[PDB]
């Protein structure tokens, strides 16, 4: 069986390269259903993902899509449980897609539903996000990527960090209030899957790289350990600053007095503020419309 | 793939060598000539063809007496036949089991009564009964012991540890012996199926081979004999006889397509039926070199 | 058998201390007075009384706040209390593992952040929940694992071993080690049951013995408190009192006739609640010496 | 730069944590007090403190029993411990090949075998032996195979396509990914010296600095302990106290000046050896936050 494999596996590459790609596709798969009649899902596993790679590999994204599916069906068939070495198996084959594959997008979704159906995330494995998230960039599909890498690791947070940042530098027009537009998501979206360590790194990263390109006028607050960049023609900055170390205190007082204080920005982040009042603050009363 | 037998009736390593097909598609036939190609080709090893149909269907294919007794066949000192009686609900593979176990014991007790040892045993399975179904239950119920293992393993193993990794160390050795008794290696235990061109004939392979890969068991060789040919013996004519092929022909193509990557060895169809040692040694020399219906004609109608 | 538990009280090798009782049947109080008497006959040892109560009846027992961490009763440098809560339906046994694992984890963690190590530990059984069902289930599933072992031995060793007792051993290895962890000894371990002589306790001791037999776990203590003895008391009178205990006295035979060779301490029965570590103590110490109604009714007329 | 290990002891991205230092400088003591810092700081992680020192330093320094199999320090549920022997001329880089990836096959052995797994791992190097040697044949040797790989395009690649950049694609490939090794990226990786403030001490720190710069492993942290500060101490007095740190103080400087942007904490002399889970926290708590000889005097005259 397992030098049965191996060997077909270059006849069928051999018929990739040679341009029989209905004789490589139609084979492999009547092959591939007979190991998984007989729920030998494991060799139906590496068979077809080999296969599946091979013709992505050679440009051809109608076999390598519809092998990925084919795959994920098994996924499911054997129950296969997310961890590494079934994560990793999809990275690969998402790492040889091409970012403008007409079904991208349903390959993805496929990965990722399979994921959360066998694992204890909601949403899916953290690890297998980072990679669709560099994917769904590649094809200009910005606000899918910022998603997933909302959801991703460590590597997914400084990928976000690029997006944004990349966003913001292709602005013509930079404005005060364009800098919040890009900075707000970071320190909202970490903010509510509570990840200050990531609100944090991302905030200190892109409030860095904006000092070091538009020159504004700025300067560091610290205090008990917490610091501030106050910026002098950035306020939307300074109360998103504010408004992510408060969290941290989960104290209702220091919220009220913060939006107080920034009545127009509390309308702005009316529903943003609601939300982050009843994580951070129990607040049950809905947010009072200041203007 | 070559169509043929070639790489199995010369290999020196194997020492399983499986042979079914239900149906009454011949199964007798095959494994007399699978063993006689094997025992000509490798004279430096001994080999054994053992039956468990109750017709005593090496006996009459041969034409000399086979009983539990292993007797080398009469002009070969290569080549030896065992005829054994396989019998003379509750737990799943125990039944299969002892019928196994017990026909293992008549191999060992006849290589200590003189024949000595057999290098590659060719196993004529029973034309009914799936004696391969315990095939499975030592993967299974080990697999079983690993969910249990483990999961008896509570939190800890710091507080497991404190009133008593062993468990999860001899089961993963129990599990790979178990495991290595089923795989028996695929360059070491093979099975080969016989069949014709027919509709049941097809259906009853297909099957026969899912069961086998649900065993893990090495499968890449699908005999069919009685095949016709007819559009190239040297004396044509006879619409009864082409039609027939026309249909044969029909289904041939359903099996080189369905099993693309295995050893589809086409046999020819033989006047009357093959028996003796002569016709069948020279009737197995196609598992060896494919027939060609243009040029071996003679042979064919030779055995006639 | 002596009416008290003495043995215990002064035992230095016992290192579990069960303690349960359902029925409202004063469990607190015999739990904080057991822990009390074992503290103060070993000054040489740290002892640990942990509830999981949601009442927290230790708190309200003795007069302070207990929580989580471990703290010294105070006026006591041998007696620690702790109150944790235990929680803050396919497979038997894990449930209840989660939880007897997680309680253990509280008490390693207090052994570490100051109190070092605590020699027997005063278990206060919830008042409701068998939080001591997975005390069967290692000794189950393990001998599955035997009958799973040996049957997995078909006809062999011989051929058992030309395809592939390690599974024999080990597995009376893990057999032995489980066992090991129920039975913990009757010597290191032992449990401690709380009642009253009135019917519905009985049925609920009765019950709650034969489930830590079933569970091989040591029993032979027997508390029966609010014992009216109301035939000795130095101020007789009352019919209402001389009723209630002429039907305590009823089963109160029951028990000695149920349990003859277990430890029946019979306890008296105070005015009011027994609180504060000064009543408990001298309530206490009835358990160590036997109550006679006639010369200690001062020492219980006193607690009122 | 803070002289402090607060940044690192306080890090969930840092998987590989390194510390040397030859000359018995109190390596086992650092590595020790570090791995407890980083266990007590992020409670959601499993730490792993591995040594291959012969003279069981973890065991001496715990009071415990540690063996190649990964055991939890008593009193915590956060930090392991593990004492393996890293061995029970023509190719450089081979020899520490093996002698790493041994070490790290004891690792995943223990995260199967319960543990399941440990975020970072506190590497104890090895008194001798730069057991970091191998740190620099992967980069050697590749680059060697990119003067190879292009010198190999003789005049073309017109012709040398006609009679056969699939080979600069795939050595930038294998390039990156071995670089990726050794780099291992300095928020995942960073190596911990440990020394004292005398000549010889700065000698072999020095050294060591250059070695680990030549693998470009991260390097900034430098751990000075035996320390007297002798010029704080409630309680002055006794010259033979002054001279010493007088000398400690001369090296102390040419260390500030030496190495000016690394973490070079200070660490206090302590009467005696510090050993027991406890005297380590509570002298490992200086790692974190700078030792000041003025007030912290109590906490030292503490481990006495
Ligand atoms: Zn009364
Ligand atoms: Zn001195």
Redesign the interface.
Same mark, same amino acid.
């Given at each position: 069986?397992?030098? @049965?494999l191996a060997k077909?596996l270059q006849?069928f590459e051999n018929k990739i390269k040679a341009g029989d790609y209905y004789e490589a596709h139609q084979?492999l798969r009547? %092959?591939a259903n007979?190991?998984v009649?007989? @729920?030998?899902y494991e060799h139906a596993i590496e068979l077809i993902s080999q296969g599946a790679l091979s013709f992505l590999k050679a440009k051809q994204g109608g076999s390598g899509t519809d092998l990925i599916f084919y795959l994920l069906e098994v996924y499911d068939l054997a129950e296969v449980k997310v961890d590494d070495i079934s994560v990793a198996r999809l990275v690969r084959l998402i790492a040889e897609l091409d970012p403008s594959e007409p079904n991208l997008k349903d390959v993805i979704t496929g990965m990722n539903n399979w994921s959360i159906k066998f694992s204890e995330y909601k949403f899916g494995d953290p690890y297998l996000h980072n990679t669709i998230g560099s994917k769904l960039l590649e094809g200009d599909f910005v606000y899918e990527a910022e998603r997933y890498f909302m959801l991703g690791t460590?590597d997914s947070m400084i990928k976000y960090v690029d997006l944004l940042w990349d966003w913001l530098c292709q602005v013509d027009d930079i404005e005060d209030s364009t800098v919040a537009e890009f900075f707000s998501r970071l320190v909202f979206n970490y903010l509510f899957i509570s990840n200050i360590?990531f609100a944090h790194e991302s905030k200190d990263i892109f409030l860095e790289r904006f000092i070091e390109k538009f020159h504004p006028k700025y300067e560091k607050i610290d205090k008990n350990g917490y610091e501030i960049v106050f910026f002098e023609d950035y306020s939307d900055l300074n109360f998103l600053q504010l408004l992510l170390i408060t969290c941290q205190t989960a104290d209702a007082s220091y919220f009220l007095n913060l939006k107080n204080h920034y009545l127009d920005f509390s309308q702005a982040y009316k529903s943003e503020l609601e939300f982050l009042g009843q994580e951070y603050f129990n607040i049950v009363a809905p947010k009072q419309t200041n203007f | 793939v070559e169509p043929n037998l070639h790489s199995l009736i010369t290999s020196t390593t194997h020492k399983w060598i499986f042979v079914g097909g239900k149906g009454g598609v011949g199964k007798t036939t095959s494994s007399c000539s699978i063993a006689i190609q094997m025992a000509l080709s490798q004279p430096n090893k001994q080999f054994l063809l053992i039956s468990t149909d109750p017709a005593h269907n090496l006996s009459d294919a041969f034409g000399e007496k086979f009983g539990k007794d292993a007797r080398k066949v009469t002009g070969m000192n290569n080549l030896s036949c065992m005829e054994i009686d396989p019998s003379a609900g509750s737990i799943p593979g125990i039944d299969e089991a002892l019928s196994f176990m017990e026909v293992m014991k008549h191999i060992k007790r006849q290589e200590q009564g003189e024949g000595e040892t057999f290098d590659t045993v060719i196993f004529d399975t029973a034309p009914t009964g799936h004696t391969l179904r315990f095939l499975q239950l030592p993967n299974t119920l080990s697999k079983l012991l690993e969910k249990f293992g483990e999961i008896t393993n509570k939190l800890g193993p710091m507080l497991n540890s404190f009133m008593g990794i062993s468990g999860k160390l001899n089961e993963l050795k129990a599990n790979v012996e178990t495991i290595r008794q089923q795989?028996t290696d695929? =360059?070491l235990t093979t099975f080969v199926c016989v069949c014709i061109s027919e509709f049941l004939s097809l259906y009853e392979t297909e099957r026969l %081979?899912?069961?086998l %890969?649900?065993y =893990?068991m =090495?499968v890449?060789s699908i005999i069919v004999n009685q095949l016709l040919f007819a559009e190239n013996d040297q004396e044509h004519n006879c619409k009864r006889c082409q039609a027939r092929w026309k249909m044969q022909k029909k289904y041939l193509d359903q099996i080189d397509?369905?099993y693309? =990557?295995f050893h589809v060895v086409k046999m020819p169809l033989c006047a009357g039926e093959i028996r003796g040692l002569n016709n069948l040694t020279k009737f197995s020399q196609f598992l060896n070199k494919e027939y060609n219906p243009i040029t071996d004609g003679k042979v064919i109608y030779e055995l006639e």
């Amino acid at each position: 069986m397992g030098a @049965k494999l191996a060997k077909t596996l270059q006849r069928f590459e051999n018929k990739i390269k040679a341009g029989d790609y209905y004789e490589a596709h139609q084979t492999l798969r009547t %092959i591939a259903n007979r190991y998984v009649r007989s @729920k030998s899902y494991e060799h139906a596993i590496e068979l077809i993902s080999q296969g599946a790679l091979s013709f992505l590999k050679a440009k051809q994204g109608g076999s390598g899509t519809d092998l990925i599916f084919y795959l994920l069906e098994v996924y499911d068939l054997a129950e296969v449980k997310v961890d590494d070495i079934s994560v990793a198996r999809l990275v690969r084959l998402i790492a040889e897609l091409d970012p403008s594959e007409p079904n991208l997008k349903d390959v993805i979704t496929g990965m990722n539903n399979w994921s959360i159906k066998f694992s204890e995330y909601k949403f899916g494995d953290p690890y297998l996000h980072n990679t669709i998230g560099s994917k769904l960039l590649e094809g200009d599909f910005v606000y899918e990527a910022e998603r997933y890498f909302m959801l991703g690791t460590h590597d997914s947070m400084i990928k976000y960090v690029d997006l944004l940042w990349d966003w913001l530098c292709q602005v013509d027009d930079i404005e005060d209030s364009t800098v919040a537009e890009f900075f707000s998501r970071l320190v909202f979206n970490y903010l509510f899957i509570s990840n200050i360590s990531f609100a944090h790194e991302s905030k200190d990263i892109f409030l860095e790289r904006f000092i070091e390109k538009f020159h504004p006028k700025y300067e560091k607050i610290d205090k008990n350990g917490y610091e501030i960049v106050f910026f002098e023609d950035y306020s939307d900055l300074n109360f998103l600053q504010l408004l992510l170390i408060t969290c941290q205190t989960a104290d209702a007082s220091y919220f009220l007095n913060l939006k107080n204080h920034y009545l127009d920005f509390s309308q702005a982040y009316k529903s943003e503020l609601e939300f982050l009042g009843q994580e951070y603050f129990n607040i049950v009363a809905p947010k009072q419309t200041n203007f | 793939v070559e169509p043929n037998l070639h790489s199995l009736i010369t290999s020196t390593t194997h020492k399983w060598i499986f042979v079914g097909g239900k149906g009454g598609v011949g199964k007798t036939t095959s494994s007399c000539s699978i063993a006689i190609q094997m025992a000509l080709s490798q004279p430096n090893k001994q080999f054994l063809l053992i039956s468990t149909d109750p017709a005593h269907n090496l006996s009459d294919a041969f034409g000399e007496k086979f009983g539990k007794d292993a007797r080398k066949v009469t002009g070969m000192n290569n080549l030896s036949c065992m005829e054994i009686d396989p019998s003379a609900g509750s737990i799943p593979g125990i039944d299969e089991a002892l019928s196994f176990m017990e026909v293992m014991k008549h191999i060992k007790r006849q290589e200590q009564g003189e024949g000595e040892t057999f290098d590659t045993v060719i196993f004529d399975t029973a034309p009914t009964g799936h004696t391969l179904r315990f095939l499975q239950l030592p993967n299974t119920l080990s697999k079983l012991l690993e969910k249990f293992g483990e999961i008896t393993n509570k939190l800890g193993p710091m507080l497991n540890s404190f009133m008593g990794i062993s468990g999860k160390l001899n089961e993963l050795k129990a599990n790979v012996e178990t495991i290595r008794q089923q795989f028996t290696d695929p =360059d070491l235990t093979t099975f080969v199926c016989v069949c014709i061109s027919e509709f049941l004939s097809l259906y009853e392979t297909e099957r026969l %081979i899912q069961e086998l %890969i649900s065993y =893990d068991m =090495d499968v890449n060789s699908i005999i069919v004999n009685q095949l016709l040919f007819a559009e190239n013996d040297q004396e044509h004519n006879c619409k009864r006889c082409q039609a027939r092929w026309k249909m044969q022909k029909k289904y041939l193509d359903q099996i080189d397509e369905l099993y693309e =990557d295995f050893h589809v060895v086409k046999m020819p169809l033989c006047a009357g039926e093959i028996r003796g040692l002569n016709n069948l040694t020279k009737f197995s020399q196609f598992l060896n070199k494919e027939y060609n219906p243009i040029t071996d004609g003679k042979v064919i109608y030779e055995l006639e």
